[PDB]
């Protein structure tokens, strides 16, 4: 699921939830919630896209 896609990229990159949430500028809770499969449109999607240097298209769709 989407949070996996996000995470596994960060992991390889070296980043984790804290660094992620910071760089995104979201709440730490929102990262867990992302990994709770809770929301397709999280309140930082474009911000996440910049955070992993991916597109919004890819984040939503995803290969």
UniProtKB/Swiss-Prot annotation:
- A single GO molecular function term of this UniProt record: DNA binding
Report the residue ranges that make up the HTH cro/C1-type domain in this protein. Answer: 6-59
DNA-binding region(s) in UniProt? 17-36
Instruction: Tell me which UniProt keywords the record has, alphabetically.
Output: DNA-binding, Repressor, Transcription, Transcription regulation
KW Repressor (keyword) present: yes
| The keyword Cell membrane is annotated on this UniProt entry | no
Oligomer and partners? Homodimer, when bound to an operator.
* Functional note: Binds to two sets of three contiguous operator sites in the phage genome.
Q: What is this protein called?
A: Repressor protein CI
State the species of origin: Enterobacteria phage 434 (Bacteriophage 434)
């Amino acid at each position: 699921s989407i949070s996996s896609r996000v995470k596994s990229k960060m992991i390889q990159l070296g980043l984790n939830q804290a660094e992620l949430a910071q760089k995104v500028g979201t709440t730490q809770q929102s990262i867990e919630q992302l990994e709770n499969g809770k929301t397709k449109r999280p309140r930082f999607l474009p911000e996440l896209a910049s955070a992993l240097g991916v597109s919004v298209d890819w984040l939503l769709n995803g290969t």
